[PDB]
Amino acid sequence: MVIQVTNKEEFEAILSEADKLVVVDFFATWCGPCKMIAPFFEELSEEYPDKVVFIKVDVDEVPDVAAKYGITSMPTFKFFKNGKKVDELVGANQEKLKQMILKHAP
Ligand SMILES: [Cl-]
Numbered sequence: 001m002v003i004q005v006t007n008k009e010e011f012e013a014i015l016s017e018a019d020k021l022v023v024v025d026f027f028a029t030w031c032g033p034c035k036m037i038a039p040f041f042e043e044l045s046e047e048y049p050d051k052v053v054f055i056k057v058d059v060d061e062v063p064d065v066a067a068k069y070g071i072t073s074m075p076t077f078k079f080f081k082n083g084k085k086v087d088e089l090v091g092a093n094q095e096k097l098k099q100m101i102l103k104h105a106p
């Protein structure tokens with residue numbers, strides 16, 4: 001399951017409270033590659049739930065989060081562990097996304 005997060009307060013609560021790796025898909029409704037990778041992100045979320053929390057944030061609906069985390073193109077995947085950013089992938093390359101999850105959630 002990919003969790004839809006619709007406000008900064010809940011976003012920050014998830015990041016500061018999670019023990020698992022958190023992977024965030026920052027996307028937009030007008031973004032073409034976002035639509036391509038969305039079903040793949042859903043599959044990953046079903047394959048790796050024990051070790052990873054999967055979140056999606058619509059940058060135009062939660063702009064304060066998009067601004068705070070310095071988003072400049074969509075989709076961008078940010079990876080957090082213990083409240084701190086440990087990696088990021090800009091764009092919708094499926095191979096690199098899966099590998100980055102495997103790297104940070106062995
Ligand atoms: Cl790590």
Ligand SMILES: [Mg+2]
């Ligand atoms: Mg859905």
Ligand SMILES: [Mg+2]
Binds near residue numbers: 028029030060
């Ligand atoms: Mg929109």
Ligand code: NA
Binds near residue numbers: 018020
């Ligand atoms: Na959690």
Ligand code: NA
Binds near residue numbers: 053
């Ligand atoms: Na999840």
